[PDB]
Structure formats: C-alpha cells, structure tokens
Write a protein that binds this ligand. Structure first.
Ligand SMILES: [Zn+2]
Ligand SMILES: [Zn+2]
Lengths: 49, 72, 404
RNA sequence: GCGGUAGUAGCAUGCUAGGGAGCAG
RNA sequence: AGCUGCUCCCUAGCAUGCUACUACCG
C-alpha cells in the first residue's frame, strides 16, 4: 500500500504539472496573437482617414 | 530509350533551378517550357533537339565547373 | 451537334452569322470557340420584342374577356400570335391568360441570348449611350420591380426582390431565379460588401455591415453597434477577416491579364509564384531497368510526371473563371427536381452541434488570409474557449461575415 | 481441499492520445 | 499553404478483459 500507492501520487502530480504548464503556454500565445492583430488593425487605418 | 532522356531532362531542370536560374523570368519560362515539352514528347528525335537547347542554358553560365565534373 | 439543321437555319436567316461559320468545326463549343456567345447574343432583341408583344397580347385578352392557354408554338419569331381554337369567351374586363408553360420553358434562353442587354442603354436603344448609374447607389429595388412588371406581368406568384422576405426555401429559389436575370443590367461595382464607418474608442473604422448579392438582393446585418469601447477576441476575429479594411486601405489596381474584376493591391509589388520539378529516384529506376522494364515497344511506360510552371501560372489558371456565365434556370422544373433530389437524402440526420462535439483531424493546416501570418489552425482552436466559438456561431445567424 | 481480496509476470481485445507514410475526389 | 474519405506503420497511456503463479482472510 504505502510504497506502491505513492508511486502513483507522483505520477498524477507530474501529469497535472505538465497539463498546467501547457495551459499556461497556450494562454500566453493567445495574448501574443491578439496583440499582433490589434497592432495590424490600428496600423492599417493610419493610411485611409 | 526515351525514358532515359525524360529522366535526364528532369535532373537537368532540377540542377538549373538549384543554380538560381528562376531569378530571370525569361530564362525560367524558356527552360520550363522546354522541359514540359520534352516530357510530353512521343518520338525520340524531337526530344534530343529540345534537350540540346535546354542543356545550352547550363553550358552558358559559368557556375558549374565543367572540367572537374568531366573527369570521366 | 450531329443534326442541328433548324438552329443553323435560324442563325443565318436573321443574320446572326453566315453559312461559312459552320465550317469552323467546333463552332458549337463553349470553352473552345468562346465566340459563339457573340453570335447567340444577336438573337437577343427578337426575344425582347417577343416578350413585349406577349404582354400586349395578355392585356388584350384580359380586357376583351377571353380565357386561354398561351403556348410557345403559337408565336412566330416576329412576335405575332395566332391559333385561337381553344379559347373560351367570358364577360369583358375579366379575361385571364395562363402563362406558366410559356415563361418557364422559355426562361433558359433569356440568358443564353442575353435578351435584356438593351436595358442598360439610354432609353432602351441599342443605338444610344449606356445609362450612367450613380456610383454610390447600391439598392436597385424599384428597378427590379419595374422590370418584372414590364416583361413578366401576368406571372401570378409573388416576387420578392430581396429574398430576406421569402416564405420558405422554394420561394427563395423562385425569387433568386429572377434576381439572376435582372442583375445583369446593373453596374458590377454595386455588388459586394456594404461598408460603413463605425467608431471604437473614439477611432473610426470602416467595416462591412451587410452585403448586396446578385441572387439574394440586399441584406443588412442585425447587430451593428456604433460607438464601442474595446473589442473582445471574437470581434477582433470578425474585423480582421473582413475584406473591408484590407481593400479600403490598399492601392487601386488595374490588371489587364484577366477579365475578372480586380479590386485592390494589398502591397507595392506583384508576386509571381513558380512550381519546381520533381526529384529523380535513380536507384529504383536502375533496378526497374535491370529487370526488363521500359524496353521499347512495351505495354507499360512512364506517363505521370512532375510538371514545372513559371510565374504566370497562378493568375493564368485563376482566369478560368471566365467560364462561369449568369445562367437562369427553368424554375417550374427545378422546383420538382429539387424534391426528387432531396428524396434521395432521406435516410440521414443532421442539425447543429455545440463547439465541444466537433472533430478536427489535422490541426496543422493553414488558416487562410490574413490569419496565416500568426499560426496554423491550432492557434485559433486553442485561443478560443468553447464559449467564444459558440458566440461566433450564434452570431452568424444574424449577420454576414465576408471572408477572403 | 475450495471461496474472497491483494500481487507479479504473461496475453488478447477495444478505445483514446501522438507521429510517419500512401491513394482517391 | 485547402476541404474530405479510406488504408498501412510506429509509439504512449488507461480501463476493461483474459491467464498463470505468489501473499491475507473466509
Ligand atoms: Zn420569395
Ligand atoms: Zn441548425
């Protein structure tokens, strides 16, 4: 029990860690792309007014 | 015998393209048309005419050191 | 094309061409010899006059008080009518003609012979200048109704110039059939997105509110809000996918390589994309040759290759859209063919699904323009929650998003 | 001598996930 | 740099299933 159970504690803790790592990176890339397209939208109108 | 010249024309156009020959639209159009016309040929005496015309393009510029690759 | 004797006789009797045209073997074809359109369009005015005289005949029948069925085979190619052998007589002012087989059978010939081309001429004179329409006018709703009342006057079905007011899908087909014809009179710069200036955070944008279509008429968005404070992800997506601000802010373009109407040039120099030749796998070729393959006079020989192309290959191939003409279909028959075709699809089931039930195989495929400057489809399927996608979907049920 | 759980090793199936490649419209 | 459909191959994880043998109880 207490030497094979905690052999799964680390398993599930590490997979939770990697899933939240990837969620953090996927939430940063969203911010990067929205900044990029906002920059495009605002630089495109500075040619027509 | 015609399959030989068709594969050879494929290799020749690939070499020409590696030598940055598509930087001049006139030359690239000429070579592209000669190549596609060789691949559709159906008598091995026209293919050799267009092959000598196509190889003249490589023999023109001096980028490939011919005397070396001709060590036989 | 084996026996088209009466067509030849008709084409030369009214000086559409001359007998030496029919020795150009392939004269009938459409994609080779695309000049047959110019010789068909020379029958346009005989057909226009036929339509006008059938309206006159319908009016005379209505007033005089006669009831009968008009058929095509009772009208010579001048326009005059005859054969009154099955008409019956009722009280005047209350006669009624029946034009259903006439008009619906005739319909496909009105766009082959371009019969209404004399209506974009100064009076309707083929000898006068064109009508100079206004450049900012995009809603020709009364001219459609006037054309309908001039040519198809006794066609008893309701015609909605804008199919937004239609009653089902068969009514949509019926009214778009007429829009297809009438839209060949108006200027081709009045179709497309309908931009309009909005303000967000005290800055003006130009964005499409809804599009005018050749088949569907005018369509206006329902949730268009002037004066906004900030844009969410979804609104950034729907304002970066529109062609409004891309085409409003680029150089004007005149491309004489194509006949397709060219809008704008998004940057200062045109790009010519080529195609390379394949690679030779010499080991397999040698191996095949060493076992008796490719000997001269054999059954199997090499005919599939990698063909290379030069710069004028993308546009010279896009120009094949010149083969799409404005066809107007026979509607009383299409409205039966559609029922049988639908009966062929009776053992399935469909409907809407939520964003958490879609299946996307291969999320590494490009995302179109302009989204392919920032990532593939994975980036836009990860950056939107299951509520941004659902907001988007439920948004396109009330608005029109044109794309590129 | 057998029933119950807990094991390891081995086996098959099925399903998800990931990657590579081929054909068809 | 597209939308689909089918097929082969490799890897991973999980549960299920299956079987053998070992430890505890009944
Ligand atoms: Zn309608
Ligand atoms: Zn639905």
């Amino acid at each position: 029990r207490d030497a094979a159970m905690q052999r799964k504690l680390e398993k599930m803790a590490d997979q939770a860690m990697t899933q939240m790592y990837k969620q953090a990176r996927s939430e940063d890339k969203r911010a990067k792309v929205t900044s990029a397209m906002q920059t495009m939208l605002f630089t495109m109108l500075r040619k027509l007014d | 015998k015609m399959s030989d010249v068709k594969c050879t024309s494929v290799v020749l156009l690939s070499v020409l393209q590696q030598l940055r020959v598509e930087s001049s639209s006139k030359l690239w159009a000429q070579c592209v048309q000669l190549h596609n016309d060789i691949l559709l040929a159906k008598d091995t005496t026209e293919a050799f005419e267009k092959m000598v015309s196509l190889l003249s393009v490589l023999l023109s510029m001096q980028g490939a050191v011919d005397i070396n690759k001709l060590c036989e | 094309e084996g026996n088209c004797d009466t067509l030849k006789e008709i084409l030369v009797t009214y000086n559409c061409c001359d007998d030496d045209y029919f020795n150009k073997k392939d004269w009938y074809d459409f994609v080779e010899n695309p000049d047959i359109l110019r010789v068909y369009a020379n029958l346009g005015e005989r057909v226009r006059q036929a339509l006008l005289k059938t309206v006159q005949f319908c009016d005379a029948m209505r007033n005089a008080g006669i009831v009968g069925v008009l058929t095509l085979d009772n009208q010579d190619l001048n326009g005059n009518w005859y054969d009154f052998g099955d008409f019956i007589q009722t009280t005047p002012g209350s006669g009624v003609p029946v034009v259903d087989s006439y008009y619906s059978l005739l319909m496909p010939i009105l766009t082959l012979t371009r019969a209404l081309t004399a209506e974009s001429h100064v009076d309707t004179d083929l000898t006068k200048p064109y009508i100079k329409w206004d450049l900012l006018k995009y809603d020709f709703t009364e001219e459609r109704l006037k054309l309908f009342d001039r040519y198809f006057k006794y066609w008893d079905q309701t015609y909605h110039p804008n199919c937004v007011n239609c009653l089902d899908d068969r009514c949509i087909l019926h009214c778009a059939n007429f829009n297809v014809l009438f839209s060949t009179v108006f200027p081709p710069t009045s179709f497309g997105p309908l931009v309009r200036k909005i303000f967000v955070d005290g800055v003006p944008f130009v964005v499409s509110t809804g599009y005018h279509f050749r088949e569907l008429g005018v369509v206006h968005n329902q949730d268009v809000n002037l004066h906004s404070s900030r844009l969410s992800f979804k609104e950034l997506l729907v304002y970066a996918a529109d062609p409004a601000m891309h085409a409003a802010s680029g150089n004007l373009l005149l491309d004489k390589r194509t006949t397709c109407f060219s809008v704008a040039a998004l940057t200062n120099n045109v790009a010519f994309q080529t195609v390379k030749p394949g690679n030779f796998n010499k080991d397999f070729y040698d191996f095949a040759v060493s076992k008796g393959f490719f000997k001269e006079g054999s059954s199997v020989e090499l005919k599939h290759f990698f063909f290379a192309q030069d710069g004028n290959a993308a546009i010279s191939d896009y120009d094949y859209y010149r083969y799409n003409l404005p066809t107007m279909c026979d509607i009383r028959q299409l409205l039966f063919v559609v029922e049988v075709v639908d009966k062929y699809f009776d053992c399935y089931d469909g409907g809407c699904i939520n964003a958490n039930q879609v299946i996307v195989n291969n999320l590494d495929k490009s995302a179109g323009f302009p989204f392919n400057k920032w990532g593939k489809a994975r980036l836009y399927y990860d950056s939107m929650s299951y509520e941004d996608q659902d907001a988007l979907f439920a948004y396109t049920k009330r608005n029109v998003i044109p794309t590129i």
